[PDB]
Coordinates of N, CA and C in Angstrom, one line a residue:
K3 N -3.4 -9.0 -15.4 CA -3.3 -7.6 -14.8 C -4.6 -7.0 -14.4
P4 N -5.2 -7.5 -13.3 CA -6.5 -7.1 -12.8 C -6.6 -5.6 -12.3
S5 N -7.6 -5.3 -11.5 CA -7.8 -4.0 -10.8 C -8.4 -2.9 -11.6
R6 N -8.7 -3.0 -12.9 CA -9.3 -1.9 -13.6 C -8.6 -0.6 -13.3
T7 N -9.2 0.5 -13.3 CA -8.6 1.8 -13.0 C -9.6 3.0 -12.9
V8 N -9.7 3.6 -11.8 CA -10.6 4.7 -11.6 C -10.2 6.0 -12.3
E9 N -9.1 6.6 -11.9 CA -8.6 7.8 -12.5 C -7.1 7.6 -12.7
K10 N -6.6 8.2 -13.8 CA -5.2 8.0 -14.2 C -4.2 9.2 -13.9
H11 N -3.2 8.8 -13.1 CA -2.1 9.7 -12.8 C -1.1 9.0 -13.7
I12 N -1.5 7.9 -14.3 CA -0.7 7.1 -15.2 C -0.5 7.9 -16.5
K13 N -1.4 8.8 -16.8 CA -1.3 9.6 -18.0 C -0.2 10.6 -17.8
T14 N -0.4 11.6 -16.9 CA 0.6 12.6 -16.6 C 2.1 12.1 -16.8
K15 N 2.9 12.9 -17.5 CA 4.3 12.5 -17.8 C 5.1 13.1 -16.6
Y16 N 5.8 12.2 -15.9 CA 6.6 12.6 -14.8 C 8.1 12.6 -15.2
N17 N 8.8 13.7 -14.8 CA 10.2 13.8 -15.1 C 10.9 12.5 -14.9
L18 N 11.6 12.1 -16.0 CA 12.4 10.8 -16.0 C 13.5 10.7 -14.9
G19 N 13.3 11.3 -13.8 CA 14.3 11.2 -12.7 C 13.7 11.6 -11.3
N20 N 12.5 12.0 -11.2 CA 11.9 12.4 -10.0 C 11.2 11.3 -9.2
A21 N 10.9 11.6 -7.9 CA 10.2 10.7 -7.0 C 8.9 10.2 -7.6
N22 N 8.1 11.2 -8.2 CA 6.8 10.8 -8.7 C 6.9 9.8 -9.8
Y23 N 8.0 9.8 -10.6 CA 8.2 8.9 -11.7 C 8.2 7.5 -11.1
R24 N 9.1 7.2 -10.1 CA 9.1 5.9 -9.4 C 7.8 5.5 -8.8
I25 N 7.1 6.5 -8.2 CA 5.8 6.3 -7.6 C 4.8 5.8 -8.7
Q26 N 4.8 6.5 -9.8 CA 3.9 6.2 -10.9 C 4.2 4.8 -11.4
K27 N 5.5 4.4 -11.5 CA 5.9 3.1 -12.0 C 5.4 2.1 -11.0
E28 N 5.4 2.4 -9.7 CA 4.9 1.6 -8.6 C 3.4 1.4 -8.7
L29 N 2.7 2.5 -9.1 CA 1.2 2.4 -9.2 C 0.8 1.4 -10.3
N30 N 1.4 1.6 -11.5 CA 1.1 0.7 -12.6 C 1.4 -0.8 -12.3
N31 N 2.5 -1.1 -11.6 CA 2.7 -2.4 -11.2 C 1.6 -2.9 -10.2
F32 N 1.1 -1.9 -9.4 CA 0.1 -2.3 -8.4 C -1.2 -2.7 -9.1
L33 N -1.5 -2.0 -10.2 CA -2.7 -2.3 -10.9 C -2.6 -3.6 -11.7
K34 N -1.4 -3.9 -12.2 CA -1.1 -5.1 -12.9 C -0.9 -6.3 -12.1
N35 N -0.3 -6.2 -10.9 CA -0.1 -7.3 -10.0 C -0.7 -7.0 -8.6
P36 N -2.0 -6.9 -8.5 CA -2.6 -6.5 -7.2 C -2.4 -7.6 -6.1
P37 N -2.2 -7.2 -4.9 CA -2.0 -8.2 -3.8 C -3.4 -8.8 -3.6
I38 N -3.5 -10.1 -3.5 CA -4.8 -10.8 -3.3 C -5.8 -10.0 -2.5
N39 N -7.0 -10.0 -2.9 CA -8.1 -9.3 -2.3 C -8.0 -7.8 -1.9
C40 N -7.2 -7.0 -2.7 CA -7.0 -5.6 -2.5 C -7.5 -4.8 -3.7
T41 N -7.9 -3.6 -3.5 CA -8.3 -2.7 -4.6 C -7.5 -1.5 -4.3
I42 N -7.7 -0.4 -5.1 CA -6.9 0.8 -4.8 C -7.6 2.1 -5.3
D43 N -7.0 3.2 -4.8 CA -7.5 4.5 -5.2 C -6.6 5.6 -4.7
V44 N -6.0 6.3 -5.6 CA -5.1 7.4 -5.2 C -5.8 8.7 -5.1
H45 N -5.3 9.6 -4.2 CA -5.8 10.9 -4.0 C -5.7 11.7 -5.3
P46 N -6.8 12.4 -5.7 CA -6.8 13.1 -6.9 C -6.0 14.4 -6.7
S47 N -5.1 14.7 -7.6 CA -4.2 15.8 -7.5 C -3.0 15.6 -6.6
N48 N -2.8 14.4 -6.2 CA -1.7 14.0 -5.3 C -1.4 12.6 -5.4
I49 N -0.4 12.2 -6.2 CA -0.1 10.8 -6.5 C 0.6 10.2 -5.3
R50 N 1.1 11.1 -4.4 CA 1.9 10.6 -3.2 C 1.0 9.9 -2.2
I51 N -0.3 10.1 -2.2 CA -1.2 9.4 -1.3 C -2.1 8.3 -1.9
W52 N -1.9 7.1 -1.3 CA -2.7 6.0 -1.8 C -3.5 5.4 -0.6
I53 N -4.6 4.7 -0.9 CA -5.4 4.1 0.1 C -5.8 2.8 -0.5
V54 N -5.3 1.7 0.0 CA -5.6 0.3 -0.4 C -6.7 -0.2 0.5
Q55 N -7.6 -1.0 0.0 CA -8.6 -1.6 0.8 C -8.5 -3.1 0.7
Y56 N -8.2 -3.8 1.8 CA -8.1 -5.2 1.8 C -9.2 -5.9 2.5
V57 N -9.9 -6.8 1.7 CA -11.0 -7.6 2.2 C -10.5 -9.0 2.7
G58 N -10.5 -9.2 4.0 CA -10.0 -10.4 4.6 C -10.2 -11.7 3.9
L59 N -9.1 -12.4 3.7 CA -9.2 -13.8 3.1 C -10.1 -14.7 3.8
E60 N -11.0 -15.3 3.1 CA -12.0 -16.2 3.7 C -11.3 -17.3 4.6
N61 N -10.1 -17.8 4.2 CA -9.4 -18.8 5.0 C -8.6 -18.2 6.2
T62 N -9.0 -17.1 6.7 CA -8.3 -16.5 7.9 C -9.3 -15.9 8.9
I63 N -8.8 -15.7 10.1 CA -9.6 -15.1 11.2 C -10.1 -13.7 10.8
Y64 N -9.6 -13.2 9.7 CA -10.1 -11.9 9.3 C -11.1 -11.9 8.1
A65 N -11.5 -13.1 7.8 CA -12.5 -13.4 6.7 C -13.5 -12.3 6.5
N66 N -13.7 -11.8 5.3 CA -14.7 -10.8 4.9 C -14.7 -9.5 5.7
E67 N -13.7 -9.2 6.5 CA -13.7 -7.9 7.2 C -12.9 -6.9 6.5
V68 N -13.5 -5.9 5.9 CA -12.8 -4.9 5.1 C -11.9 -3.9 5.9
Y69 N -10.7 -3.8 5.5 CA -9.7 -2.9 6.2 C -9.0 -2.0 5.2
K70 N -8.6 -0.9 5.6 CA -8.0 0.1 4.7 C -6.5 0.3 5.2
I71 N -5.6 0.4 4.2 CA -4.2 0.7 4.5 C -3.8 1.9 3.7
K72 N -3.4 3.0 4.4 CA -2.9 4.2 3.7 C -1.4 4.1 3.4
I73 N -1.0 4.8 2.4 CA 0.4 4.8 2.0 C 0.8 6.3 1.6
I74 N 1.7 6.8 2.4 CA 2.2 8.2 2.1 C 3.6 8.1 1.6
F75 N 3.9 8.6 0.4 CA 5.2 8.6 -0.1 C 5.9 9.9 0.2
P76 N 6.9 9.9 1.1 CA 7.6 11.1 1.5 C 8.3 11.8 0.3
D77 N 9.0 12.9 0.7 CA 9.7 13.7 -0.3 C 10.8 13.0 -1.0
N78 N 11.6 12.2 -0.2 CA 12.7 11.4 -0.8 C 12.4 9.9 -1.0
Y79 N 11.3 9.6 -1.6 CA 10.9 8.2 -1.8 C 11.6 7.9 -3.2
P80 N 12.2 6.7 -3.4 CA 12.2 5.5 -2.6 C 13.4 5.4 -1.6
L81 N 14.1 6.4 -1.3 CA 15.2 6.4 -0.4 C 14.7 6.3 1.0
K82 N 13.7 7.1 1.3 CA 13.1 7.0 2.6 C 11.9 6.1 2.3
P83 N 11.6 5.1 3.1 CA 10.5 4.2 2.9 C 9.2 4.9 2.9
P84 N 8.1 4.3 2.3 CA 6.8 4.9 2.3 C 6.2 4.8 3.7
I85 N 5.4 5.7 4.1 CA 4.8 5.7 5.4 C 3.5 4.9 5.2
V86 N 3.5 3.7 5.7 CA 2.3 2.8 5.6 C 1.7 2.4 6.9
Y87 N 0.4 2.4 6.9 CA -0.3 2.0 8.2 C -1.8 1.9 7.9
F88 N -2.5 1.2 8.8 CA -4.0 1.0 8.6 C -4.8 2.2 9.0
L89 N -5.9 2.4 8.4 CA -6.8 3.5 8.7 C -7.9 3.2 9.6
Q90 N -8.7 4.2 10.0 CA -9.8 4.1 10.9 C -10.4 2.7 10.9
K91 N -10.2 2.0 12.1 CA -10.7 0.7 12.4 C -9.7 -0.4 12.0
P92 N -8.5 -0.3 12.6 CA -7.4 -1.3 12.3 C -7.8 -2.7 12.7
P93 N -7.1 -3.7 12.1 CA -7.5 -5.1 12.5 C -6.7 -5.4 13.8
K94 N -7.4 -6.1 14.7 CA -6.8 -6.4 16.0 C -5.8 -7.6 15.7
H95 N -4.5 -7.3 15.6 CA -3.5 -8.2 15.4 C -2.2 -8.0 16.2
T96 N -1.5 -9.1 16.5 CA -0.3 -9.0 17.3 C 0.6 -7.8 17.0
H97 N 0.9 -7.6 15.7 CA 1.8 -6.5 15.3 C 1.1 -5.2 14.9
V98 N -0.2 -5.1 15.1 CA -0.9 -3.9 14.7 C -1.4 -3.1 16.0
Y99 N -1.2 -1.8 16.0 CA -1.6 -1.0 17.1 C -2.9 -0.2 16.9
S100 N -3.4 0.3 18.0 CA -4.7 1.1 18.0 C -4.7 2.2 16.9
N101 N -3.6 3.0 16.8 CA -3.5 4.1 15.9 C -3.4 3.6 14.4
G102 N -3.1 2.3 14.3 CA -3.0 1.7 13.0 C -1.6 1.4 12.6
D103 N -0.6 1.9 13.4 CA 0.8 1.6 13.1 C 1.0 0.1 12.8
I104 N 2.0 -0.2 12.1 CA 2.3 -1.6 11.8 C 3.8 -1.9 12.2
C105 N 3.9 -2.9 13.0 CA 5.3 -3.2 13.4 C 5.8 -4.2 12.4
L106 N 6.5 -3.8 11.5 CA 7.1 -4.6 10.4 C 8.4 -4.1 10.0
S107 N 9.4 -5.0 10.1 CA 10.8 -4.6 9.8 C 10.9 -4.0 8.4
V108 N 10.2 -4.5 7.4 CA 10.2 -4.0 6.1 C 9.9 -2.5 5.9
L109 N 9.0 -2.0 6.8 CA 8.6 -0.6 6.7 C 9.6 0.3 7.4
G110 N 10.6 -0.2 8.0 CA 11.6 0.6 8.6 C 13.0 0.2 8.6
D111 N 13.5 -0.6 9.5 CA 14.9 -1.0 9.6 C 15.4 -2.1 8.6
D112 N 14.4 -2.6 7.8 CA 14.8 -3.6 6.8 C 14.5 -3.1 5.4
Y113 N 13.9 -2.0 5.3 CA 13.5 -1.4 4.0 C 14.7 -1.0 3.2
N114 N 14.5 -1.1 1.9 CA 15.5 -0.7 1.0 C 14.8 -0.2 -0.3
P115 N 15.2 0.8 -0.9 CA 14.6 1.4 -2.1 C 14.0 0.5 -3.1
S116 N 14.5 -0.7 -3.3 CA 14.0 -1.6 -4.3 C 12.6 -2.3 -3.9
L117 N 12.2 -2.3 -2.6 CA 11.0 -2.9 -2.3 C 9.8 -2.4 -3.1
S118 N 8.9 -3.2 -3.5 CA 7.7 -2.8 -4.3 C 6.6 -2.6 -3.3
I119 N 5.8 -1.5 -3.6 CA 4.6 -1.2 -2.8 C 3.7 -2.4 -2.7
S120 N 3.4 -3.0 -3.9 CA 2.5 -4.2 -4.0 C 3.1 -5.3 -3.0
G121 N 4.4 -5.4 -3.0 CA 5.0 -6.3 -2.1 C 4.9 -6.0 -0.6
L122 N 5.1 -4.7 -0.3 CA 5.0 -4.3 1.1 C 3.6 -4.7 1.6
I123 N 2.6 -4.3 0.8 CA 1.2 -4.6 1.1 C 1.0 -6.1 1.2
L124 N 1.5 -6.9 0.3 CA 1.3 -8.3 0.3 C 1.9 -8.9 1.5
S125 N 3.1 -8.4 1.9 CA 3.8 -8.9 3.1 C 2.8 -8.7 4.2
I126 N 2.2 -7.5 4.3 CA 1.3 -7.2 5.4 C 0.1 -8.1 5.4
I127 N -0.4 -8.5 4.2 CA -1.5 -9.4 4.1 C -1.2 -10.8 4.6
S128 N 0.1 -11.3 4.4 CA 0.4 -12.6 5.0 C 0.7 -12.5 6.5
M129 N 1.0 -11.3 6.9 CA 1.3 -11.1 8.4 C -0.1 -11.3 9.1
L130 N -1.1 -10.8 8.4 CA -2.5 -10.9 9.0 C -2.9 -12.4 9.0
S131 N -2.4 -13.1 8.1 CA -2.8 -14.6 8.0 C -1.8 -15.3 9.0
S132 N -2.3 -15.6 10.2 CA -1.6 -16.3 11.2 C -2.2 -16.1 12.6
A133 N -2.0 -17.2 13.4 CA -2.6 -17.2 14.8 C -4.1 -16.8 14.9
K134 N -4.5 -16.5 16.1 CA -5.9 -16.1 16.4 C -5.9 -14.6 16.8
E135 N -7.0 -14.1 17.3 CA -7.2 -12.8 17.8 C -7.0 -11.7 16.7

């Protein structure tokens, strides 16, 4: 269970039925099972906002190029998927756009409440590993 931990929202007790609860549960799993080459940091005073930083896998056309992926958990998460996309300076990839949007079924038409954030992000990481450009 890598990743250490900067500041804890892990402490705060969230109502055993609210959206934050599930989000907190998702954070802990993220710290315990980090997607390869990613680190994390959540907004202080707002557990709904996360920013993951992914350092390109050496064995890929993205080797050593640091990229950031923001995650916004809406009001009705996990019923409504989390809003996920790359931040300032997206990676030039087939399914990634200038604004950072990500064309991935999982983030929209194939998403279901049970998907894990660490998993969404890991899916994104493997998407980056493929082809050239």
